[PDB]
């Protein structure tokens, strides 16, 4: 404990993960668990999964010190195609739906606060995404200016919700007593529950690039993933107890803006409005921060042969230093996704899709341990086979449980991942344009 070099990194770990997740997901988690008790474990196990996932992905992250992440872990053990399919889905599914989902949910909350028509959600989701894509092409003056406040004023609506929520007048241990209900049976439920809590835990993957950047890693590096994601774990459980102290299972699942309602009970008048402003900020900072780290992918495929208009995609505008053309493609496919999907449907794709490759990455660490067990390992996954296999065990479990629950979602991501198999090979002989 107390290394000082890494309490700075720990900031990141908490910040990368924490955001707009807890503020909107309960609606899904309780609408699937059908009981407070089962939903509350899903946040714990998903968290215990990613503390697992995070430590396994750091070994491959230290073998390959790079900011590219996965795009390169997967080429390096699974060949140029999987280095590609990773990015192809990142560029066509993951980034566009993460803009999309969040922009939708924003508008949703905007209409909830400034009590407006529930028709005018999509136009607002369009215009936030269109605005923030545009604003990002102005430069990292503004993009980053949104980010700094978005990190200050995402922790305050929480610390204010936990304090008061846990202190709610009608409340205590009884406010989570139905553990597993028969209307929502445990197995079908825990699969739709984990995939909804795992969206809140998202961005934990960035630990590979973090460990890449590290200097003399092990010293405190595992403590930073342990401590980091367990502070996130700690928070995500504690603010849920607060939500269940005010409302409960049926009620949370009821409005698609859960935290916003618990706000309006916890505080009367503008007090609770100041909390929802904090939420709309938290959502907007994510949208923007996703765009920010989104423009990186189409460009890295434009770095290689991998994309049809590689020259147009790789264009960094000499003014801003950003490949805006990647984001104009991602704005389009995000906009189709806002008009075609529904927030939870989308936030589900995202967990399924990414974990299809994330698994591969952990599997890869164990592969790597047998391909070149003489490569240099600055950080090595502790309790060696246990935890990567834990992450795999839980990883595998999601991709099978989403298949079997959401067959359409499992196919939209699969249609769109495998629509890139032709793409890859067209522009490998031709090399793009």
């Amino acid at each position, epitope marked *: 404990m107390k290394e000082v070099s890494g309490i700075t990194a720990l900031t990141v770990v908490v910040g990368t993960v924490i955001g707009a997740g807890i503020f909107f997901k309960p609606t899904a988690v309780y609408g699937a668990a059908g009981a407070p008790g089962l939903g509350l474990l899903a946040w714990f196990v998903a968290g215990i999964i990613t503390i697992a996932g995070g430590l396994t992905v750091a070994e491959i992250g230290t073998i390959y*010190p*790079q900011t590219g992440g996965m795009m*390169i872990y997967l080429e390096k053990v699974y060949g140029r195609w999987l280095g590609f399919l990773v990015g192809w889905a990142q560029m066509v599914i993951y980034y566009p739906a993460n803009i999309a989902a969040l922009a939708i949910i924003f508008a949703t909350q905007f209409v909830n606060l400034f009590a407006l028509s529930d028709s005018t959600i999509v136009p607002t989701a369009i215009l936030t995404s269109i605005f923030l894509m545009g604003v990002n092409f102005l430069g990292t003056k503004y993009s980053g200016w949104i980010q700094t406040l978005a990190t200050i004023l995402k922790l305050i609506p929480l610390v204010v919700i936990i304090v008061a929520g846990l202190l709610y007048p009608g409340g205590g241990v009884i406010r989570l007593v139905p553990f597993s209900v028969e209307t929502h049976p445990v197995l079908t439920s825990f699969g739709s529950a984990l995939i909804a809590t795992l969206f809140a835990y998202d961005g934990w993957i960035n630990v590979g690039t973090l460990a890449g950047e590290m200097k003399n890693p092990g010293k405190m590096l595992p403590k930073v993933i342990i401590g980091g994601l367990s502070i996130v774990m700690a928070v995500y459980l504690l603010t849920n107890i607060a939500y269940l102290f005010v409302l409960d299972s049926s009620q949370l699942a009821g409005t698609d803006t859960p935290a916003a309602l618990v706000a309006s009970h916890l505080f009367e008048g503008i007090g609770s409005k100041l909390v929802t402003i904090g939420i709309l900020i938290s959502v907007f900072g994510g949208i923007n921060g996703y765009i920010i780290s989104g423009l*990186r992918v189409p460009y*890295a495929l434009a770095t290689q042969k991998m994309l049809p208009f590689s020259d147009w995609f790789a264009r960094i505008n*000499p003014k801003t230093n950003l490949p805006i053309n990647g984001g104009l493609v991602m704005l389009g496919i995000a906009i189709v996704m806002i008009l075609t999907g529904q927030f939870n449907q989308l936030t589900d794709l995202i967990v399924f899709v990414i974990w299809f490759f994330i698994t591969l990455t952990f599997i890869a660490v164990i592969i790597l341990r047998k391909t070149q067990p003489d490569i240099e390992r600055p950080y090595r996954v502790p309790f060696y086979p246990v935890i990567p296999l834990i992450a795999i065990i839980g990883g595998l479990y999601i991709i099978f449980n989403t298949l079997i629950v959401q067959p359409k979602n499992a196919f939209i991501g699969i249609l769109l991942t495998l629509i890139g198999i032709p793409i890859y090979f067209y522009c490998k002989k031709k090399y793009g344009s």
Partner: nanobody, 124 residues
């Protein structure tokens, strides 16, 4: 506080070979990832190479893979770019940049310190 100065690149012949050098401020170098980028007089920047702090990871762009080789001498705070089999579509100012942390980057925006760049002209 990290000054970088490029060396070597001038007029060269097709198929020929050119070693580029980039001298950096010091201290911070050994802990920093490096990389070269090239800027043609119609385009913006473009990824060429990048190397880990320890020099373990290395990554080159599609058009220069196989020809060029990036390398660094942390003892003499320098990063090299051993280009070979040069084509006249290489011709551009090769700026050498620095960023923070060991992880190498193909992204120009990661890079915070940037050099003036040395002009290269490959001809026939």
């Amino acid at each position: 506080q990290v000054q970088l100065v490029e060396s070597g690149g001038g007029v060269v012949q097709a198929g020929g070979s050119l070693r580029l050098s980039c001298a950096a401020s010091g201290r911070t170098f050994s802990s920093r990832a490096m990389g070269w980028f090239r800027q043609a007089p119609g385009e913006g920047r473009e990824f060429v190479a990048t190397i880990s702090w320890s020099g373990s990871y290395t990554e080159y762009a599609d058009s220069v893979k196989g020809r060029v080789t990036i390398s660094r001498d942390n003892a003499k705070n320098t990063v090299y770019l051993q280009m070979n089999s040069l084509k006249p579509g290489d011709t551009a100012v090769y700026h050498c940049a620095a960023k923070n942390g060991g992880a190498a980057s193909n992204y120009p925006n990661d890079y915070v310190y940037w050099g003036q760049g040395t002009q290269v002209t490959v001809s026939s």
